[PDB]
Amino acid sequence: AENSASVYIKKVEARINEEIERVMHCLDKSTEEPIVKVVERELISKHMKTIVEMENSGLVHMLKNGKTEDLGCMYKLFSRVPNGLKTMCECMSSYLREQGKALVSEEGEGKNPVDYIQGLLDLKSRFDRFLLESFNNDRLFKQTIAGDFEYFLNLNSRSPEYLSLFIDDKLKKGVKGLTEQEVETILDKAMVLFRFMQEKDVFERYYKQHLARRLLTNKSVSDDSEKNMISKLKTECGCQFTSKLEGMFRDMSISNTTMDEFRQHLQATGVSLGGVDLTVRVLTTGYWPTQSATPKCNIPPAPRHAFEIFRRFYLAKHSGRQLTLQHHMGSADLNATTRKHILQVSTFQMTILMLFNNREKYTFEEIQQETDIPERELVRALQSLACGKPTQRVLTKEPKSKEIENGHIFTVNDQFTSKLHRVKIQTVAAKQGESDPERKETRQKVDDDRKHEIEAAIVRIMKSRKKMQHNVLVAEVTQQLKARFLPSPVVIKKRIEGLIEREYLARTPEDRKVYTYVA
């Protein structure tokens, strides 16, 4: 009552020290077991409940401000009395839950995922530093913090997505932390944070999407850190999806071999003035998520000739396969022309600009009637070229408005603000919005991925194992997928009974006594 949790610990430590000194110097030889036991049971066992939680700089406040000496002395004092570390870790976990809920709060739009992941990593590093400095690497504290992280991190389904965005931001360019030591430390911290994370399927899917985004754009991002990333993934994930990652890296390798060989062949042929500079790439459908490779749209004449030459070469010297045309990938360099400044089009504005070159003074009807254009990508490209543009506009209009009309004429502005000859319009890859349609479609995709993965596991494992009666093998199949994602009991229960319609371990429900151990 006369003090608080700040100076009371030093006073009680001094009291214990003087009591033990007196008992060892002024009394008999041993004289200490019952004395120290009863002293502890009176002081610590009574002050433990109230001095760490009530108020006025107890345990939570002395940890929030970052008092290392207070934490160290509390750990060294409460370690003598049993059930002290238990409530210490309980209060620490309660504070961790409160901080996480204050940090993982979803109510409110306009949060930066990279900043959120950076703050979470900073909190984790601060707690680890406090543990190392005060708790002397106690196993109980580490277990409690690991459990607390597992408990509060999986509140929102977008946490692995935000981690993937953060790692993409750190990997795209090492502007912050030019040297390699801090990069290595931050990567180690990131993988440590990912260690206490569930739902690895969405994490891998978004990491692969980020790989596709960063490898199908301007190259020479790091050129060395990919090996470090794959090495860390091997030591963290294993050999489940890392092999496919290096496989799509080999796909990139095959692609660049194709670029150089096609350049050589175009030099050999050199028929039309459409292949001045070709940077074509060749990828496989299985590795990269290019299943939506059918935007059927018109191509500008020089790109038309280039694509025709490439297709003829690929059908002549690479027989046995056919190519598919698409527009939702790649880029281009448009040489405009007082100086000759070269623009940049990401294969979205090429058709509209080519139509403008053929005839100016067009509108929405002109670019929607004689071009065979899709719906959503048309709107996105039109908005990128016209709406929300800074003072470097390359496609202006007379009806200045936010919403898109039908009868609006398109013009072009000089905009000499570009100080170089290579000016690009990077309207794509804007602030991470993660809209509802894309989130829903990727959630459906990952749900189907899990639904096929569980079937693959059950047909790969149960062929060499025993049979189940009611719920025997489901425990094993969930344990094998414990480190992957949630067991989802209802989903697996509904899916295991769908294979009974045909052969290959039909798993008859009525005849569940024995299962068909055949093929």
Residues at the interface with another protein (CB under 8 A): 216, 244, 247, 255, 258, 276-287, 289-291, 293, 300, 302-303, 306-307, 310, 314, 320-324, 326, 329-337, 342-343, 347, 350, 353, 356-357, 412, 445, 448-449, 452, 456, 459, 494-495, 498, 501-504, 519
Encode 236-254 in three state secondary structure: HCCCCCHHHHHHHHHHHHH
Category of 136 on φ-ψ map: left (φ > 0), alpha (ψ -120 to 50) or beta: left
Q: Report whether 310 contacts 262 (CB < 8 A).
A: yes
Shortest distance in whole angstroms from residue 274 CB to another protein: 9
Q: 3-class SS at 279? A: coil
Of 105 and 444, the one with the shorter C-beta distance to another protein is: 444
Shortest distance in whole angstroms from residue 166 CB to another protein: 27
Q: What is the CA radius of gyration of the chain?
A: 32
Q: 3-class SS at 410? A: strand
Shortest distance in whole angstroms from residue 90 CB to another protein: 45
Category of 108 on φ-ψ map: left (φ > 0), alpha (ψ -120 to 50) or beta: left
Chain centroid to CA 267: how far? 42
Shortest distance in whole angstroms from residue 509 CB to another protein: 13
Q: Report whether 499 contacts 507 (CB < 8 A).
A: yes
Q: 3-class SS at 396? A: strand
The single-letter code of the amino acid at 513 is K
Of 14 and 506, the one with the shorter C-beta distance to another protein is: 506
Q: Report whether 211 contacts 165 (CB < 8 A).
A: no
Of 443 and 494, the one with the shorter C-beta distance to another protein is: 494
Of 224 and 503, the one with the shorter C-beta distance to another protein is: 503
Shortest distance in whole angstroms from residue 356 CB to another protein: 7
The 10 Å Cβ neighbour count of residue 157 is 12
Of 23 and 329, the one with the shorter C-beta distance to another protein is: 329
Kindly report the length of the chain: 519
Shortest distance in whole angstroms from residue 243 CB to another protein: 9
d(CA 291, CA 209): 13
Shortest distance in whole angstroms from residue 336 CB to another protein: 5
Q: Report whether 199 contacts 158 (CB < 8 A).
A: no
Of 5 and 282, the one with the shorter C-beta distance to another protein is: 282
Residue 342 pairs in a beta bridge with 335, 422
d(CA 72, CA 45): 19
Q: Specify the DSSP class assigned to residue 347.
A: S
Of 152 and 310, the one with the shorter C-beta distance to another protein is: 310
Of 170 and 200, the one with the shorter C-beta distance to another protein is: 200
Shortest distance in whole angstroms from residue 242 CB to another protein: 14
